[PDB]
Design a protein around this ligand. Structure first.
Ligand SMILES: Nc1nc2c(ncn2[C@@H]2O[C@H](COP(=O)(O)OP(=O)(O)O)[C@@H](O)[C@H]2O)c(=O)[nH]1
Lengths: 37, 420
């Protein structure tokens, strides 16, 4: 029971970190280069 | 020769260009199919005449609609510069994020059409000042072509925000943003407005069921009459540069109002006579202009007239002499013989005469001031701003555009009354 509630704490920590992390242009810049050259 | 290239912009400019090409085909005897049944057209194997007309826009529904209507085969399938997102009535959209990635497709195609000729005497732009695409995209094309080609003459048949209502809520912002980048790099801005166009198709012409194709036909007949003195013979011919000289005495006051004639009722088209004194009456009549600025509330810095049809030159001489004689102080007197006159030797399709009056006068300054007024109103109170400010533009440029408009108009007004 201590271990199951302890992994419940684990799950809480991991959902908090997921919510935390919840918070392409290179080719178009080459296109930007084409015109000037 | 003495070429023209017809770049378009916005749905407005696209429709106007479509109908202008319709008019010039129907005048030069060109079908919608592109045959004859080079000053404007190009030769193509199989006996075809392709108009060197580029249609650029940020939306293709306009492109599709102009392709769909008659005379669509004129434009060849490369000059349809396709935009997919649309600036959505945002000068920032139409000038910075989508400009700086459409510039160069347009550059390749305009170099295409420019090397296609030998001597490109002048350009041709028709666009808007209020629509995001039209305004931003168009003034950006103007800046670019004036960057590489400094020897040509720039010319915009420009529609402005309407007086009684603004067509799009940010008409003032887009309009001041267009004029701020128009003044220095656009050499002849023919100022047109949808409302005055409505007035001229309504009042003396019986038109009770108008349409956008109709206004396009009107302004395109005018647009053909302004230059028809070029591709045709005449006892006294001109061009874009004799006109530009006789029109601008200063590089700034170069924005022009235009009118074309004749235009009368049709049910009454038989009761009236049809003479050149009547042509003078017709357009020196105040109401016949295509701008929401009666020029007799100001002064004529100068004015040019271009005839079409074969009558005498005694005519044009007594013409500008008589008109100067009575409406003298309606002009400006600090400049001698401020009316220039030329003759094209061919009359219009089916009629007897045509006349085109162009005017470098100081009555569009109030148009500019009303634009700046609407701008400053929405501007201090910050109306409709994040659409411009969240796309890499700052209101420092808005302030400078407004102040630059005001500077232009301050010269306009003081040159109205400057005498010595
Ligand atoms: N004369 C004329 N003006 C038009 C026509 N269609 C739209 N306009 C004007 O053009 C403006 C729209 O500008 P535009 O650049 O085409 O809009 P955008 O493409 O969404 O940026 C409006 O203020 C209209 O009054 C037309 O067929 N003829």
């Amino acid at each position: 029971m201590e271990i199951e509630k302890h992994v419940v704490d684990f799950q809480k920590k991991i959902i908090e970190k997921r919510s935390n992390i919840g918070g392409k242009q290179i080719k178009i810049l080459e296109n930007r280069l084409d015109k000037a050259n | 020769m003495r070429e023209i290239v017809h770049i378009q912009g916005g749905q407005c400019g696209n429709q106007i260009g479509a109908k202008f090409w319709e008019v010039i085909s129907d005048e030069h005897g060109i079908d919608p199919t592109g045959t004859y049944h080079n000053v404007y057209y190009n030769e193509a194997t199989g006996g075809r005449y392709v108009p060197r007309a580029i249609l650029m826009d940020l939306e293709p529904g306009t492109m599709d609609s102009v392709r769909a209507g008659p005379f669509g085969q004129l434009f060849r399938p490369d000059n349809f510069v396709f935009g997919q997102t649309g600036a959505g009535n945002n000068w920032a959209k139409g000038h910075y994020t989508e400009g700086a990635e459409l510039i160069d497709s347009v550059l390749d195609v305009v170099r295409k059409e420019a090397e296609g000729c030998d001597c490109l005497q002048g350009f041709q732009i028709t666009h808007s000042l209020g629509g995001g695409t039209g305004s931003g995209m168009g003034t950006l094309l103007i800046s670019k072509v004036r960057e590489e080609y400094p020897d040509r003459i720039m010319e915009t048949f420009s529609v402005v925000p309407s007086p009684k209502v603004s067509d799009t809520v940010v008409e003032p912002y887009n309009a001041t943003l267009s004029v701020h980048q128009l003044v220095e790099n656009a050499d002849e801005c023919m100022v047109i407005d949808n409302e005055a166009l409505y007035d001229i198709c309504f009042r003396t012409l019986k038109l009770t069921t108008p349409t956008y194709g109709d206004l396009n036909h009107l302004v395109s007949a005018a647009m053909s009459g302004v230059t028809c003195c070029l591709r045709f013979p005449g006892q006294l011919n001109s061009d874009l540069r004799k006109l530009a000289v006789n029109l601008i005495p200063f590089p700034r006051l170069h924005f022009f109002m235009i009118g074309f004639a004749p235009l009368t009722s049709r049910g009454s088209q038989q009761y009236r006579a049809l003479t050149v004194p009547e042509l003078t009456q017709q357009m020196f009549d105040a109401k016949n202009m295509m701008c929401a600025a009666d020029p007799r509330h100001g002064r004529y810095l100068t004015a040019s007239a271009l005839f079409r049809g074969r009558m005498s030159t005694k005519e044009v001489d007594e013409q500008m002499l008589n008109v100067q004689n009575k409406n003298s102080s309606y002009f400006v007197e600090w400049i001698p013989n401020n009316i220039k006159s030329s003759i094209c030797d061919i009359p219009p399709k089916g009629l007897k005469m045509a006349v085109t009056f162009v005017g470098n006068s100081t009555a569009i300054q109030e148009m500019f001031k009303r634009v700046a007024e609407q701008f400053t109103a929405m501007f201090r109170r910050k109306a409709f701003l994040h659409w411009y400010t969240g796309e890499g533009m700052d209101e420092m440029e808005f302030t400078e555009a407004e102040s630059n408009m005001n500077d232009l108009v301050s010269e306009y007004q003081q040159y109205q009354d400057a005498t010595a």
